[PDB]
Amino acid sequence: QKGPVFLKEPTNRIDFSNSTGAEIECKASGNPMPEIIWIRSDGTAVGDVPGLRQISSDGKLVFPPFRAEDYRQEVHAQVYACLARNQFGSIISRDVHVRAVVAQYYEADVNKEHVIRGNSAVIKCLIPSFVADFVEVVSWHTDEEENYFPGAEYDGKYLVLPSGELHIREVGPEDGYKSYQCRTKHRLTGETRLSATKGRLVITEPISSSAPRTPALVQKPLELMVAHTISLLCPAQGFPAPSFRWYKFIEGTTRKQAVVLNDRVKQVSGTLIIKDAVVEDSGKYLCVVNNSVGGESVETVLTVTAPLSAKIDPPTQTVDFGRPAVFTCQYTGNPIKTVSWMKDGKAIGHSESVLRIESVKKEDKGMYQCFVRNDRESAEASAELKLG
Amino acid sequence: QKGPVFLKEPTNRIDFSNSTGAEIECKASGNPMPEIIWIRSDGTAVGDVPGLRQISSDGKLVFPPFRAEDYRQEVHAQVYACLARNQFGSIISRDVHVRAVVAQYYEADVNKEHVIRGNSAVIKCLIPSFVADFVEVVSWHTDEEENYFPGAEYDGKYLVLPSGELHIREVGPEDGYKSYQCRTKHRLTGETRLSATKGRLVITEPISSSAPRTPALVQKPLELMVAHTISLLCPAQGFPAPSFRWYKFIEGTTRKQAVVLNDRVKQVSGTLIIKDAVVEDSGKYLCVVNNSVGGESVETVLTVTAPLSAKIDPPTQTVDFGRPAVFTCQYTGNPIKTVSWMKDGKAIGHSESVLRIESVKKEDKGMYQCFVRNDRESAEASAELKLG
């Protein structure tokens, strides 16, 4: 009567501490009822590893809480998938990236920030790259007991940016007598802590003029989710204190247009702040920095991501021998890196949205799937071909 | 008998401290002898400012040593040029960027470096962007009195990179008990100093596996001179400790080829080191980082620069009325952003290497110039048109 279809698939990412453990679930319909098999996304079947990974009932793959000593990479840093299968054929779920992280001490640092008097300053909370997936800045604190939270600007001067930095307008020599520490939160342990070091502004008096200079290391391409607020920085120091202008390149050209500042898109000193991000905010942005001595510019690439989904039209069709079978994968999300097709769990080497079988023979019956992928996400849709 | 030609032009950059002062020289031939006028490159004539800028004899523009209090931006941060002129017409020299910098205290910092045991580490000497044009790393020093200089690797482990960082192979927990300071040199004052802070490696024990992660901020496009050694870094941390591969994109494509390691081009852990750089080393490079968990990559753009020069063929020609006059600008150097032509000191709106005057009329006699420019350098060539 029916080939398998997924009712419930596990999400693309399962991140958890060794204390929390995890369970992921896969449910499929069909007639006869499909067997549910857990595999590594590569295709190997996976089994029971005592205390670490348990195929449970209800179709649940269970990662019990475990001691640091019992960490196993092949179990705990692994991409899994669910394979649903009956006599009519096989479907494979989206990828399931499992990352069990053993609770472990980390610290964030705040270093000295050297600035020319009169310029803006950006104080950064430095989170080691290998924990940064799990740690975010909550708030900023000074020795004089000022506390700054994400939201509005304080005293026309201090702003905690959406990207976590503390932005300070128009630094004066008095600003060198404060030190700054950030509070960070680890989303897998739920713990918060203050930074191990405190940072201060070191203010240089402007005695010589100088053209704006930007740092050697600049923001690599960004990927940020729709509906969130984005901030693009443009760090630069010079004397006279420079002014800042943002542009967005016209895609595929060397031509650019001035970013249009309004209710949604605002500029704070050299920082561009985009609220309620939409996919069309993606692109290459250029910040141009000027004073009466000279100018400089830096490019930043932004991709605003949206969740991947896929659906095949039609869900099932019956086609008489020798006639054509067409399946159309319809998808949403951003970016889409690839579209690719599978038949009963095996790649069939077609990478376009519409799959056409010219003349249906007997071994063309079975389950077909469309997968849409980018670097972080995957989504699948399935469909059945029956012979008439 | 002759229009002006330059014998000696000032260099593109004149950087000097207020204690040193400076003089720049312009010499041109011609008959009658041309008057030498100093202008701002924009075209305004410049005069004597008592104690700060003196048109001297010998055709020298002199910036005397001066007190910090007497700094003047319009004098001391300015692009000048030499205008040579007689009855036959005018030529203007290449741009002369003058930067008088008042001697002023700076400090470099070395911060904590967080690394996973078994990975490579890179210790950086942080030089404020607004003095970095003048300050370079000389050497690195530890508390245990180890001294490291540019050149060869020490003990198979420590290397001071051409770009100034201290590279450390395969960090072990014992490496956390040393602290590091850099010695820097200011090329305008000639002073050396040690860094204000010392940095240490903070070593994280690998308890969980993790895919390689690279920092948020990455090297922006580089410009480095021919014949020097270049190092391209690829900072990355993960567990297992990752391996590194470098590629160079085929220009104008998304295709890449593996960099070929030999006597000139070497790899030290994740660092690519190119000796005796040539202009053909320019391009977009990709570093790909892998371990058994995952991978990442980062792009770096390199331009290898070569000094600009220009020459017009022919230096002088006589052309009878109504006939065609052709001047051909021949140039060398890299990159070349623009080529543009002038006649007696005024832009004539032609931006190609060959200038063709279709039918020579009377007001076409005069001095012609070709300018070749990029963001950092300019070179000019001149030629005379005489009527027959």
Ligand SMILES: *[C@@H]1O[C@H](CO)[C@@H](O[C@@H]2O[C@H](CO)[C@@H](O[C@@H]3O[C@H](CO[C@H]4O[C@H](CO)[C@@H](O)[C@H](O)[C@@H]4O)[C@@H](O)[C@H](O[C@H]4O[C@H](CO)[C@@H](O)[C@H](O)[C@@H]4O)[C@@H]3O)[C@H](O)[C@H]2NC(C)=O)[C@H](O)[C@H]1NC(C)=O
């Ligand atoms: C604020 O600060 C920024 C600096 O970051 C300044 O913006 C720069 O302005 C300069 C000067 O106008 C720009 O340089 C100009 O670019 C033109 C475009 O080049 C294109 O075409 C060539 C081929 O001919 C390609 O090589 C190139 O990649 C581009 O595709 C050039 O045509 C200009 O050269 C001509 O004019 C100059 C005078 O300006 C002459 O000296 C030349 O001989 C030639 O005739 C010129 O090089 C630069 O590109 C801008 N950068 C950016 C990032 O925008 C702002 O000007 C500054 N604001 C103020 C008020 O000063």
Ligand SMILES: *[C@@H]1O[C@H](CO)[C@@H](O[C@@H]2O[C@H](CO)[C@@H](O[C@@H]3O[C@H](CO[C@H]4O[C@H](CO)[C@@H](O)[C@H](O)[C@@H]4O)[C@@H](O)[C@H](O[C@H]4O[C@H](CO)[C@@H](O)[C@H](O)[C@@H]4O)[C@@H]3O)[C@H](O)[C@H]2NC(C)=O)[C@H](O)[C@H]1NC(C)=O
């Ligand atoms: C070391 O680490 C690096 C990671 O940094 C790995 O290199 C990456 O490898 C992956 C996997 O092969 C690469 O992803 C693949 O890229 C292909 C090329 O995409 C082009 O064409 C599409 C349009 O179809 C464009 O969107 C895109 O911009 C490119 O122009 C894709 O075709 C691949 O998808 C197909 O195969 C995969 C299985 O690999 C299926 O899941 C898909 O459904 C589809 O059928 C795939 O996405 C990635 O690009 C590499 N990155 C870099 C920087 O090189 C190394 O693999 C790793 N080494 C080892 C040994 O693991």
Ligand SMILES: *[C@@H]1O[C@H](CO)[C@@H](O[C@@H]2O[C@H](CO)[C@@H](O[C@@H]3O[C@H](CO)[C@@H](O)[C@H](O)[C@@H]3O)[C@H](O)[C@H]2NC(C)=O)[C@H](O)[C@H]1NC(C)=O
């Ligand atoms: C997950 O992994 C970590 C192992 O790093 C486990 O947390 C660690 O648990 C030990 C023992 O429970 C903790 O040691 C204790 O510290 C307190 C002082 O704060 C002391 O009074 C106790 O006698 C004991 O020595 C250790 O601090 C803790 N480490 C961290 C970073 O939290 C955790 O138990 C594991 N989860 C399991 C096995 O379910």
Ligand SMILES: *[C@@H]1O[C@H](CO)[C@@H](O[C@@H]2O[C@H](CO)[C@@H](O[C@@H]3O[C@H](CO)[C@@H](O)[C@H](O)[C@@H]3O)[C@H](O)[C@H]2NC(C)=O)[C@H](O)[C@H]1NC(C)=O
């Ligand atoms: C160029 O500009 C700087 C101004 O910043 C001048 O250097 C400064 O000169 C003053 C006076 O010569 C120095 O002060 C002295 O310091 C010593 C102690 O080290 C003290 O014994 C003296 O009595 C005096 O107070 C100052 O240190 C120095 N600053 C720097 C950064 O070098 C310089 O003279 C100027 N050049 C000229 C005017 O030609």
Ligand SMILES: [Cl-]
């Ligand atoms: Cl979902």
Ligand SMILES: [Cl-]
């Ligand atoms: Cl297998």
Ligand SMILES: [Cl-]
């Ligand atoms: Cl396994």
Ligand SMILES: [Cl-]
């Ligand atoms: Cl938000």
Ligand SMILES: [Cl-]
């Ligand atoms: Cl020269």
Ligand SMILES: [Cl-]
């Ligand atoms: Cl004038």
Ligand SMILES: [Cl-]
């Ligand atoms: Cl002036």
Ligand SMILES: [Cl-]
């Ligand atoms: Cl060198």
Ligand code: NA
């Ligand atoms: Na069926």
Ligand code: NA
């Ligand atoms: Na704007």
Ligand code: NA
């Ligand atoms: Na179908």
Ligand code: NA
């Ligand atoms: Na999905």
